[PDB]
Design a binder for this molecule. Structure first.
Ligand SMILES: CC(=O)N[C@H]1[C@H]2O[C@@](C(=O)O)(C[C@@H]1O)O[C@@H]2[C@H](O)CO
Length: 679
């Protein structure tokens, strides 16, 4: 077998189910006997077939259907390989979901992938569109030379008992088969020739996080575009994990982004890039004793130009599912104060409170102690900053070991080893900035209003909303949801963010994940669209600046799942078809978070008054990709030019098979012309 390129072919159109024979190529005899090597190919799929082999080498005869090697893609964007010679001999597989795409801006696009079979290192590696997707290590390294009775080299399918299996339909732009193992660097470069959309946050940036979720995107009145997202360190797991909130901005209309910062973060557990296991056992494991921030909301007060960042604050080892019922506050002298438990007291004995100037008081004696906290909630004893050891987390087999290191960090009331511990429920935190993220204010825990009967009261991620007209012009609103007397809720401020008031929008006690986003009508009234626990997106209306809301009404015509997915709905500044317009983003499948679509809803005045004054006609829908392509949480923003920016999760964030995937948070831009089918 010679060194280098054994075979190369360009521009091969493959009719679905027909495949293409490469048996007559000069190097077929070499390819049929490869001991190792590299395969790189550019392709465009025009087929909806579930599994589509791009390239394969194997035995096509009767009874030998499990003897073959193939690189395939799925209609849902997955990519992988299967190296087989019947299960008793070997069956090596490697794959990674949501690695490739099918359509972009209404047209089928090319993806570039590569498989590297490194005999020297006994390792197999998959790449696609500039990324190293997965790695398989095997003591008993195997390749094509190990398959019994190879008799064919095929493009667009795998020959099994004389039939074309895993049928591809489309075009193989180029394929190159090397006998040598090219370097990862060469493959990153080679496959990187085709990329769509861009990343704001990514594995390898200064956040030190390998994973990101929950996008927030907002264009400021100054023209600057800002963004935030969960920087999920311990895989893509929801809280009761180690998660910080990342932030970045663009001053050129969303073309390039700044080095990300971490405005909301905890230091009890170290922030580091770690590859979380994706096997059936390890994938379910999550960090047990870390404090975290989760689900960001960005908001701008156009009057003061101040920006705010909100997120849920989870004490050590807490998430929505295991939060304790209670406000986390205690009322003394008529004022609500954060309550604390001295570590040496009884398990449920919260006999202290954080009062004015962070001074900690003994509630029984009503006397101040020698302790206090600063604007970051870090402990001080007699003016000396208290510290404790930071934890590290590593996998030992399928077990996650969380252990102390020798690194000292400031002792915070939300840390598991703090001498004074906060009540284990969730909190609502925020910081403001007057210089577009150059600096942020002290930590402001605004959840003093959390109902004492509530398990959790959290934010609806995305952006908040400021009323532009009417009697409540200037009011700031942030959507919330909870497990208590009400599900949907809101917090609003009439003094530009200094103080907040909580509003219950319904009397539902089920605690469903009612994530919502707010949009303003021409007269200043508001319409809130939300995810529900039923098979539809609901709409509620307010005619009093968000103080009271109408009953939920199904959003007719926009399909969704029973469990639901967060949505993004925004106001657009210019009319579309001569009418005020709103734009909505959400996955459209009735099962699985896939088939994302951007809808344009035209606001019509019905002629009625009050809650029934307006009616939204969802006139246009725009499919972001093909039906099976993953699409989960998202956030829309009108950019300074006419365009609509979209930061979204390009994978199924619900699926137990698509957890812990890197670089799935993408940023794309669309013109109204494109969105309305006009092109
Ligand atoms: C505070 C919090 O846990 N937010 C979560 C919830 O929504 C998501 C989801 O993808 O559906 C992701 C969010 O980050 O999973 C959670 C679950 O649904 C319970 O609401």
């Amino acid at each position: 077998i010679p060194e280098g390129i054994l075979m190369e072919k360009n521009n091969v159109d493959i009719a679905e189910g027909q495949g293409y024979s490469l048996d007559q190529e000069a190097g077929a005899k070499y390819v049929k006997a490869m001991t190792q090597g590299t395969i790189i190919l550019s392709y465009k799929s025009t087929s909806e077939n579930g599994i589509q082999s791009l390239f394969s080498v194997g035995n096509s005869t009767a009874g030998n259907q499990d003897r073959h090697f193939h690189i395939y893609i799925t209609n849902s964007g997955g990519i992988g390989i299967e190296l087989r010679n019947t299960d008793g001999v070997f069956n090596y597989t490697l794959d990674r979901p949501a690695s490739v795409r099918a359509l972009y801006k209404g047209e089928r696009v090319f993806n570039t992938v590569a498989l590297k079979a490194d005999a020297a290192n006994k390792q197999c590696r998959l790449f696609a569109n500039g990324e190293l997707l997965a790695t398989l290590d095997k003591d008993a390294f195997k390749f094509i030379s190990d398959i019994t009775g190879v008799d064919n080299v095929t493009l667009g399918g795998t020959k099994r008992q004389g039939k074309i299996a895993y049928p591809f339909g489309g075009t193989i732009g180029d394929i190159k088969v090397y006998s040598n193992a090219l370097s990862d660097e060469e493959l990153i470069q080679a496959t990187g020739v085709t990329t769509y959309g861009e990343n704001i946050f990514y594995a390898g940036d200064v956040t030190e996080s390998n994973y990101f979720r929950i996008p927030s995107l907002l264009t400021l009145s100054t023209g600057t575009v800002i963004s935030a997202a969960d920087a999920r360190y311990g895989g893509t797991h929801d809280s009761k994990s180690k998660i910080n909130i990342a932030f970045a901005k663009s001053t050129d209309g969303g073309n390039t982004w700044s080095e990300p910062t971490l405005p909301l973060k905890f230091d009890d557990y170290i922030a580091k890039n770690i590859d979380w296991p994706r096997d059936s056992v390890g994938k379910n494991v999550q960090i047990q004793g870390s404090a975290s921030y989760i689900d960001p909301v960005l908001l701008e007060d156009k009057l003061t130009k101040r920006i705010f960042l909100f997120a849920d604050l989870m004490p050590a080892g807490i998430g929505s599912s295991n939060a304790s019922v209670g406000s986390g506050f205690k009322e003394v002298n008529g004022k609500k104060y954060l309550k604390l438990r001295w570590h040496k007291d009884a398990g449920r004995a919260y006999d202290y409170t954080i009062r004015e100037k962070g001074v900690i008081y003994n509630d029984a004696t009503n006397q101040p102690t020698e302790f206090r906290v600063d604007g970051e909630y870090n402990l001080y004893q007699h003016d000396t900053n208290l510290t404790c050891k930071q934890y590290d987390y590593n996998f030992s087999g399928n077990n996650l070991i969380e252990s102390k290191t020798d690194v000292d960090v400031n002792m915070n009331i939300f840390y598991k080893n703090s001498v004074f511990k906060a009540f284990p429920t969730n909190y609502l935190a925020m910081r403001y900035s007057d210089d577009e993220g150059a600096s942020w204010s002290d930590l402001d825990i605004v959840s003093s209003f959390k109902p004492e009967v509530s398990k959790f009261l959290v934010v609806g991620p995305g952006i908040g909303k400021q009323i532009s007209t009417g009697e409540n012009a200037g009011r700031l609103l942030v959507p919330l949801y909870s497990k208590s007397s009400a599900e949907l809720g809101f917090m609003y401020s009439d003094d530009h963010g200094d103080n907040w008031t909580y509003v219950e929008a319904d009397n539902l006690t089920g605690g469903a994940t009612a994530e919502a986003q707010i949009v303003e009508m021409p007269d200043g009234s508001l319409k809130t669209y939300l995810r529900t626990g039923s098979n539809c997106i609901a709409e509620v209306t307010s005619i009093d600046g968000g103080e009271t809301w109408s009953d939920r009404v199904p959003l007719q015509g926009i399909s969704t799942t029973s469990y639901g997915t967060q949505l993004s709905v925004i106001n657009y500044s210019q009319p579309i078809d001569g009418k005020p317009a709103i734009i909505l983003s959400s996955p459209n499948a009735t099962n699985g978070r896939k088939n994302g679509k951007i809808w344009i809803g035209l606001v019509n005045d019905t002629g009625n008054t009050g809650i029934d004054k307006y009616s939204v006609e969802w006139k246009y829908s725009y499919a972001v990709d093909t039906p099976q392509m993953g699409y989960s949480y998202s956030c829309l923003a009108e950019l300074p030019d006419g365009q609509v920016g979209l930061l979204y999760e390009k994978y199924d964030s619900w699926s137990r098979n698509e957890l812990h995937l890197k670089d799935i948070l993408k940023f794309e831009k669309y013109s109204i012309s494109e969105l309305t089918g006009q092109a």
